Amino acid sequence: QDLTVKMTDLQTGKPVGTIELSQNDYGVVFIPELADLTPGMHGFHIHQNGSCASSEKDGKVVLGGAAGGHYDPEHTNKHGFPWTDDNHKGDLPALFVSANGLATNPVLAPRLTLKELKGHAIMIHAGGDNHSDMPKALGGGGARVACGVIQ
Amino acid sequence: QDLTVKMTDLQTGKPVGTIELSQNDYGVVFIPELADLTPGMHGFHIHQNGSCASSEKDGKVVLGGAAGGHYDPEHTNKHGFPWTDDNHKGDLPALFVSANGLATNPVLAPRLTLKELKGHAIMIHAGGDNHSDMPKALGGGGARVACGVIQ
Ligand SMILES: [Cu+2]
Ligand SMILES: [Cu+2]
Numbered sequence: 001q002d003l004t005v006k007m008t009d010l011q012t013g014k015p016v017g018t019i020e021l022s023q024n025d026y027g028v029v030f031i032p033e034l035a036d037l038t039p040g041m042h043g044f045h046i047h048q049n050g051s052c053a054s055s056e057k058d059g060k061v062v063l064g065g066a067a068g069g070h071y072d073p074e075h076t077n078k079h080g081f082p083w084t085d086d087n088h089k090g091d092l093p094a095l096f097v098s099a100n101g102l103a104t105n106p107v108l109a110p111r112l113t114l115k116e117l118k119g120h121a122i123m124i125h126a127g128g129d130n131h132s133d134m135p136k137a138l139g140g141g142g143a144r145v146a147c148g149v150i151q
Numbered sequence: 152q153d154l155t156v157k158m159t160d161l162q163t164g165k166p167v168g169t170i171e172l173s174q175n176d177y178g179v180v181f182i183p184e185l186a187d188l189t190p191g192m193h194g195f196h197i198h199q200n201g202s203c204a205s206s207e208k209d210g211k212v213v214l215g216g217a218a219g220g221h222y223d224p225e226h227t228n229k230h231g232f233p234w235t236d237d238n239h240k241g242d243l244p245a246l247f248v249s250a251n252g253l254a255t256n257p258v259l260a261p262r263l264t265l266k267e268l269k270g271h272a273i274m275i276h277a278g279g280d281n282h283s284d285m286p287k288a289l290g291g292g293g294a295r296v297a298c299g300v301i302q
C-alpha cells in the first residue's frame with residue numbers, strides 16, 4: 001500500500017527521480033527522492049487529471065497543463081492549507097529543495113487517502129506556496145516544472 | 152485556543168520573533184514569524200522542560216540545555232517522524248528558513264494537542280532533521296540556536 005511515482009522535468013523531459021507514497025493513521029506521506037530542482041520552496045499539489053502532457057490557453061503553451069487544476073473533490077474552488085477543509089484536498093505542504101538541487105524532506109497530507117490518489121497527477125511548481133489565492137492565485141506556485149502520474 | 156510563543160536566539164540573547172500555535176482537527180499547527188535565522192532546514196522539536204536557560208555537560212556549556220531532551224510522554228527514547236508513533240511526540244516537521252533568514256512556512260504535528268504543550272519548550276536547532284538517530288543522534292539537529300517556553 002505504497003506507490004512509486006516517477007517524476008519528470010516538464011521543461012527538459014528528463015527524469016528527476018521519484019516520490020514514494022504511503023498511508024499511515026495520520027494521512028498520506030510523500031517521501032521525495034528527487035534531484036535537479038531549483039533550491040528553495042516549491043508549490044506541491046495533486047492535480048485533477050492523470051496526465052503530464054501540455055495544454056493550451058489563449059494560444060500559449062502550458063507545460064503539464066493537461067493535468068488540470070488542483071484536485072478538489074469537494075468543489076471548494078479555493079486554494080488553502082493541507083489542514084484546512086474548505087479548499088482543494090489536493091493542497092500539500094510545500095517541497096523543500098536543497099542548495100544542491102535535491103528534494104528529500106518528506107511531508108504529510110492529513111486529508112488524503114492513498115486509495116483516492118490513483119489516476120491523478122503530482123505537480124511541482126516553480127514558485128512556492130503561501131497557501132492562499134492572494135496575492136497570487138494558487139499560492140503563487142506559477143509555472144509547472146515537474147510532474148508525475150499516480151499509478 | 153492559540154498561544155503566542157516568543158522565540159529567542161540563544162547565542163545572542165535577542166528576540167527572533169514568535170510562533171503561533173493553533174489546534175485543528177488534524178493536530179497542532181505551528182505558524183512561524185521569525186527572522187535572523189540561517190537559511191536552510193533546521194531541527195524543530197518540543198523539548199521536555201519549561202526553560203531556555205543553559206545547562207552543563209562534562210564541563211562544557213549547552214545553550215538552551217536546561218530545556219531537557221525531546222518531549223517523550225510515551226517513553227520511546229527514539230527520534231523519528233511527526234507521523235510515526237514509537238518516537239518522541241515532540242518531533243515536529245523541520246522549519247524552513249529563507250535566504251533572507253526569515254521563517255514563515257507553517258507546519259503540522261498530527262500527534263500533539265495544544266493542551267499538552269503548556270510548560271514545554273519549542274527548540275530550533277542549527278542542523279536539519281532526517282528524523283532518525285542515524286547517522287547522527289536526534290536527526291542531526293546538533294546545537295540549539297533558538298528557544299521559547301510555551302505559556
Ligand atoms: Cu499545482
Ligand atoms: Cu530539539
Ligand SMILES: [Zn+2]
Pocket residue numbers: 045070078079080088090091138
Ligand atoms: Zn490548491
Ligand SMILES: [Zn+2]
Pocket residue numbers: 196221229230231239241242289
Ligand atoms: Zn526527537
